[PDB]
Symmetry: D2
Subunit: 328 residues, 4 copies
């Protein structure tokens, strides 16, 4: 006859599995920004956090739990052991560590993924994996290989942020909200991204039709500088604050909304492009994909120029060059 017993009469002890659970692996700057954005978008009924730094993991879990009054996510759990991640609909991988080269980081992150992915598959075999950790294009393949999951359930963040940055920069130039400034950045994430000028428009008005020299070395207004700013801005943010968190966190939560709510919205995400643009290797690049409750259900076939297809093909060859030497 405790206070709970005097106040509450129990009708059932029938404990059930979470219906719309999400897991964030890596409680670093990126992962925590993904965690807060998801929590504030009301996408999960349960949020699980995983990391190797036990103390930092407990602290972040508690800090999010103390905001439970202001949230609509009734359960916030964490732990080093992946048993906490059981029955997750979506698993977001952000684990890693932000002079070093890009090749040095690959096998370094592959060894990390060699533990995470099996443990994720163990407790959540029917989940959708959203890979954020860089190189995202390579690590999405790495995860797809180790998991043995079909292509659709292995999604890479890719150029979702690149396009968001593009649409914002396009928006500032024209003085219009990014929501109404349409433009697509595809292929390899980072420096090797492809700005698809043909699709760059405002209210169905192709900016290439009005300005035929758009995104060329000829261009009077030099619109190619907008894409140059997409790569520059990212480097600038690291030079100014040392890392990125908010923008990536928001972009990930948008992808989470499409998947969790089965919206069938189009996003520039990393999927296997094998069979397209003369690519025959098992490589992942960003193309606009249809995101639903089972991940990439479909992908949009973008008509590109010979110069744009070659850019994707070069990226595809370079990524496979690193992939064929990888140990699994």
């Amino acid at each position: 006859a405790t206070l709970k017993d005097q106040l509450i009469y129990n009708l059932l002890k029938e404990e059930q599995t979470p219906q719309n659970k999400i897991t964030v692996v890596g409680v670093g700057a990126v992962g925590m920004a993904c965690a807060i954005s998801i929590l504030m978008k009301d996408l999960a009924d349960e949020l699980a956090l995983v990391d190797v730094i036990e103390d930092k993991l407990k602290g972040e879990m508690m800090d999010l739990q103390h905001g439970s009054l202001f949230l609509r996510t009734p359960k916030i759990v964490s732990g080093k052991d992946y048993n906490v991640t059981a029955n997750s609909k979506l698993v977001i991988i952000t684990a890693g560590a932000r002079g070093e080269s890009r090749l040095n980081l690959v096998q370094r992150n592959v060894n990390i993924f060699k533990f995470i992915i099996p443990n994720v598959v163990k407790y959540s075999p029917n989940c959708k994996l959203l890979i954020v950790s860089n190189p995202v294009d390579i690590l999405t393949y790495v995860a797809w290989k180790i998991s043995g999951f079909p292509k659709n359930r292995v999604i890479g963040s890719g150029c979702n942020l690149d396009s968001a940055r593009f649409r914002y920069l396009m928006g500032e130039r024209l003085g219009v909200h990014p929501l109404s400034c349409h433009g697509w950045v595809l292929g390899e994430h980072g420096d090797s991204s492809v700005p698809v000028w043909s699709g760059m428009n405002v209210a169905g008005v192709s900016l290439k039709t009005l300005h035929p020299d758009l995104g060329t070395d000829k261009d009077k207004e030099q619109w190619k500088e907008v894409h140059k700013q997409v790569v520059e801005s990212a480097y600038e943010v690291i030079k100014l604050k040392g890392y990125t968190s908010w923008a990536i966190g928001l972009s990930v939560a948008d992808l989470a909304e499409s998947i969790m709510k089965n919206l069938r919205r189009v996003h520039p995400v990393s999927t296997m492009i094998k069979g397209l643009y003369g690519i025959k290797d098992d490589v992942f690049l960003s193309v606009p994909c249809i995101l639903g409750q089972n991940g990439i259900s479909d992908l949009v076939k973008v008509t590109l120029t010979s110069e744009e297809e070659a850019r994707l093909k070069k990226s595809a060859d370079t990524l496979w060059g690193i992939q064929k030497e990888l140990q699994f």
Copy 2:
């Protein structure tokens, strides 16, 4: 002319005054948590950021701007100069470094008072009709400091106070009962932090007084040890500092809740630090948390809580202690 001129025809390029602007002073862990929580709640049509560290300031602003597509705040500005804060409806002060395990309360006071001596006048200059929401610690002491420097009426000088303390309390209360913190009512008042007062009489679930059902609630004679719920509020705060070095998300979410009541003129009750001269035998200019009605004018009214002799004494002790520090402050 140019692509912009060929694509878009202009009807006017006039006025451009902010209707629902918010400023965040101090782009640290707490300041940035307030910012993201505010942006994701669609409370501002303009967000401004201020800080002494130019690099971090520019970096944080850009990181927010790059996420614009997933937000409804069409303008994010930042600067060391306070011209960027002009016409704010609400200014949040999260400036000044967090308390070092080495430094004490009095050391944190003196340091943050010197900081405020230049923040508050500059905030007032560009936003003379704004609401000041003080977060920087010791929140109670600094809400008084802000009030004195600004020359603003009591209503427009609000301190975060016990909003977080009560939020932690309702979470813990909910965890024990298997109920959502929204349905678990409990108020933590007075001095924010270690000296906070849990009001056991107001502890309820669906109007049912927990103290009426369980008279031993709050007392040391409690077999269920419910007094540990308030001890855990204090313990958890210290624990998060030991575990991750600071607190950001919890305070960021509670400040956004306060901002929501102000910006939308909701008139919801919140445990926030306000001028308590006239209540509980207090005769000095001390700012302690009591349930306040928050709207477009900040604190329009406050709720008179029936405290027990013991609960009253703790409020009086904090008032006597805080006035002791405040009476020896140079302006």
Copy 3:
């Protein structure tokens, strides 16, 4: 090859099922208000609409569908056949007469079996009046465990009370706490004991609260809750917005498994000396399994007698019903 096949390359087409399906039965004023409220709150990935009038049903579905760009619900279906309601998490019954019992029992004789058929693990949410009797009618026919059979009850009555309380105190209803229990409508019970703002008891500050002795006439606040229902019906012809919003609020707690306390009509048999199978409003913890738990309110001898009276009156009607 079509323009679709040329634009979109498919990976998988096997029609995936909804994970958060909600069904609304009766596309009347109430049903449609529930629908829009549920849609504007992003609670469903699929919305199902059922009505005997096929023309109004098709139009209501179409009108909602044309606003899909502003909503986050990718699929909105409708039909006379309950096959369109297959695998719903929550089913809302708003179908019925705006004697009032007799016809609605005959309606539920067809509705309830057809719902259970296509959605056996769903939570039933009864709105149709007399809500307290029809929740029993729905529970009786379904054979569902009492936790999965919920009635709107006094959630709206408590909403109206907190609005009036708020208007009187100049405070938002969110910060004005008060509970209206028992029967929905006239026989409802205001729990003055629990009526508060910021934990401060109004009955402690104003002992006359609820009595006829009361100079401030706070007993009128509860009478106004009853008055307003009839008043809106007289002025407008019916009530829709308020019930729609309250139903969506319950839907949010059930769908998101929040575990928030709500005054909803439940099997109160076992408490307050009640022995008959009657559904009356008491504070309930709502989640993914419906009413998982119940809040035992400390009631006065007057309040407790009012619920037993409600129980005896309702059962008196319930025993005379033919199933």
Copy 4:
């Protein structure tokens, strides 16, 4: 002392003018759908409702007020007198009755409303929903004396939303990712812009040159025919349209109230574009901010699409010239 005084200590007894006030004129099915959507989107701090039928008006005000606990708009008001509408940022006109005859009928109604709206909210943005929207936006503009930026019509925002829903249903994609612009005269004379129809920036006309032509194998012209055919179908099936228009008005209200600077196909003064030299209000993509229509998107139209806008303008002016104010 009263219970209120014993419980609450006052610091200042207010009162400030409403900061984000919205007014809805006409508490019919359209206006009440605009009301619930605005409320559920947290766009206003004050909502004012105005109508001639006092009984319906008080009943609707009370119903919304009873759900205040589930809303974030602390003040809902109503009245026959326009004093309840004072200091509004946006005033929405939905006054009329479902359906030259209907024009002059609604002109006479507007002849009273607009002056009363201007008297209490002279700095407000006017949003016209009442049909014929393109003609009644002109009527309101001339009566108000407001500059063209503060006089907006719902126009083809709903026509585009319907097009995007149908487009999305065909392709199995969300209407958010299906982009299509329906411009000009709202209703029967609406103009679909095929050159702008796209998914992920991929022009559907470029891949399928038969798009929007008679020789179309997939008959995409029927998508636009279904846009206008849907309106009549809903009218025939349930007697009126409410939910779809309410949501689209809330969308416009969001862009205005939050100064988003988003692009919407709304009815505006088109004198000077596509060979139109008359004072007519036609739908084109507009930037919607705090000052209403600040700018507009100059859509590249084919001579057939251009001629259709001219034909709309000619028919509208024919009606507009025969009106008495």
